[PDB]
Design an enzyme around this catalytic site. Structure first.
Site, PDB file in Angstrom:
ATOM      1  CG  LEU A 111      -1.798  -1.267   1.440  1.00  0.00           C
ATOM      2  CD1 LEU A 111      -2.586  -1.165   2.749  1.00  0.00           C
ATOM      3  CD2 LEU A 111      -2.682  -1.419   0.196  1.00  0.00           C
ATOM      4  CB  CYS A 112       1.171   3.926  -2.492  1.00  0.00           C
ATOM      5  SG  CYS A 112       1.889   5.569  -2.709  1.00  0.00           S
ATOM      6  CG  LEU A 113      -0.251   3.635   3.311  1.00  0.00           C
ATOM      7  CD1 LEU A 113      -0.276   2.586   4.433  1.00  0.00           C
ATOM      8  CD2 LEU A 113      -1.615   4.332   3.234  1.00  0.00           C
TER       9      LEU A 113
END
Ligand SMILES: [Cl-]
Ligand SMILES: [Cl-]
Ligand SMILES: [Cl-]
Ligand code: NA
Ligand code: NA
Length: 172
Positions: free
Chosen positions: A85-87
């Site tokens: 996940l791109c956080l």
């Protein structure tokens, strides 16, 4: 793990025992300090209410100088399962990584992002109804279909069994 990483992550777990973050249980794999497992409890004023969401933080060999890969295992309707996940605090952003971020801070950023609707790599689009269905079924998913949950959180499996017993017996 490097000795530095091992010392750091051991201390992070101790800090979480001492001050457990709301909505979030997390710990290392007893066989690999770089692989952490978390459980997010869905906040009540969200479509995730009552949900139980297992995922992982996989710290790289060069931790604390590089961020973890963040994945969610339990079907949830917000993030595609088993996908990085791109956080802001994640391995998609090694450029702005701060080694000083605590594991609680990183996990709180995951939860804070989850309850927004902001789009990012790894997020998905579902309806409110689908999210509520997945929340309702998440305890069953983790209890019966999630091999890693049973290995990492066997005490929570037993709690889940009681929770599902009460739901079945009290409503029928
Ligand atoms: Cl690599
Ligand atoms: Cl960027
Ligand atoms: Cl950035
Ligand atoms: Na154990
Ligand atoms: Na073991």
């Amino acid at each position: 793990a490097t000795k530095q990483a091992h010392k750091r992550l051991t201390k992070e777990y101790k800090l979480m025992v001492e001050n457990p973050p709301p909505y979030i249980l997390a710990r290392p794999n007893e066989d690999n300090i770089l692989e952490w497992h978390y459980i997010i409890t869905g906040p009540a004023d969200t479509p995730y209410k009552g949900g139980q969401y297992h995922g992982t933080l996989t710290f790289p060999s060069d931790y604390p100088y590089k961020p973890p890969a963040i994945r969610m295992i339990t079907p949830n309707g917000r993030f595609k399962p088993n996908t990085r996940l791109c956080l802001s605090m994640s391995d998609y952003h090694p450029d702005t990584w701060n080694p000083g971020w605590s594991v609680s801070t990183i996990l709180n950023g995951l939860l804070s992002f989850m309850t927004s609707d902001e789009a990012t790599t790894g997020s998905i689009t579902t309806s409110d109804h689908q999210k509520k269905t997945l929340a309702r079924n998440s305890i069953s998913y983790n209890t019966f279909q999630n091999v890693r949950f049973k290995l990492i959180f066997p005490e929570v499996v037993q709690e889940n069994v009681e929770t599902l017993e009460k739901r079945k017996l009290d409503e029928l």
